[PDB]
Design an enzyme around this catalytic site. Sequence first.
Site, mmCIF file in Angstrom:
data_model
loop_
_atom_site.group_PDB
_atom_site.id
_atom_site.type_symbol
_atom_site.label_atom_id
_atom_site.label_comp_id
_atom_site.label_asym_id
_atom_site.label_seq_id
_atom_site.Cartn_x
_atom_site.Cartn_y
_atom_site.Cartn_z
ATOM 1 N N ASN A 155 58.287 53.308 47.641
ATOM 2 C CA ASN A 155 57.874 52.990 46.281
ATOM 3 C C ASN A 155 57.065 54.104 45.626
ATOM 4 O OD1 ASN A 155 55.349 52.797 47.459
ATOM 5 N ND2 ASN A 155 55.121 50.573 47.166
ATOM 6 N N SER A 180 50.841 49.441 37.965
ATOM 7 C CA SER A 180 51.751 50.252 38.760
ATOM 8 C C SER A 180 51.242 51.677 38.945
ATOM 9 C CB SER A 180 53.134 50.291 38.099
ATOM 10 O OG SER A 180 53.041 50.909 36.824
ATOM 11 N N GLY A 228 54.230 55.111 45.971
ATOM 12 C CA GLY A 228 52.833 54.786 45.728
ATOM 13 C C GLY A 228 52.575 53.877 44.547
ATOM 14 N N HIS A 229 53.611 53.214 44.030
ATOM 15 C CA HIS A 229 53.515 52.276 42.911
ATOM 16 C C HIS A 229 53.923 50.891 43.371
ATOM 17 C CE1 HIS A 229 53.858 55.808 40.104
ATOM 18 N NE2 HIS A 229 54.725 56.219 41.015
ATOM 19 N N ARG A 230 53.056 49.897 43.154
ATOM 20 C CA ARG A 230 53.407 48.508 43.431
ATOM 21 C C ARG A 230 53.488 47.747 42.113
ATOM 22 N NH1 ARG A 230 50.762 45.822 48.827
ATOM 23 N NH2 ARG A 230 51.717 44.012 47.784
#
Length: 210
Positions: free
Chosen positions: A78, A88, A80-82
């Site tokens: 990802n 995000s 480092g983005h959730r």
Amino acid sequence: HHMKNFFESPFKGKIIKDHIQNPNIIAGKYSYYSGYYHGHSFDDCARYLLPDRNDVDKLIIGSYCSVGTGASFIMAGNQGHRYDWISSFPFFYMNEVEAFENSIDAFKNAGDTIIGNDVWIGGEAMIMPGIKIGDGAVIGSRALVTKDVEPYAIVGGNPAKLIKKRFSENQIAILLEIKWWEWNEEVLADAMPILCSGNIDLLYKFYKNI
């Protein structure tokens, strides 16, 4: 900081396993990249693939694959983005901001990207993280592959969808049993005129007489 073309001509590719420097790319014999129209070597097709870590998703490519110009394999999970967190934004990676000091790392792996044997990938196809592509698949030009691809499936579109399979289900089952990509070069040479045909039943007879 100039950008150079690794390819002398549109009509000459490069065998992937002979040119990669990223140890997290694993490629089988004869598979090649034809990258003249995008300049960079195959290493840069594996976007955001860290070369110095052993605990990240890898890019695995089978044998006898054909990869078209500017195809890409999106790595690093990802990145480092959730999207299921409130933001995000990758606060944890922007450590020059005191206000971000108590941020938490959002990075998640997606699993390896696995390309089977005898896979033909068209120009500027883009494979999402963690995707598995079965033996014999065809990935159409500019396909955006968001889901795993069945063996011998031809997929196309953004998002990619099944168009048809190359052969009937029974024919596919035969090919998945005999795995001609595993044959040694002496046996492969003998089968070469059959492999350069659609005669799966004849190849099956050949295989049984090996």
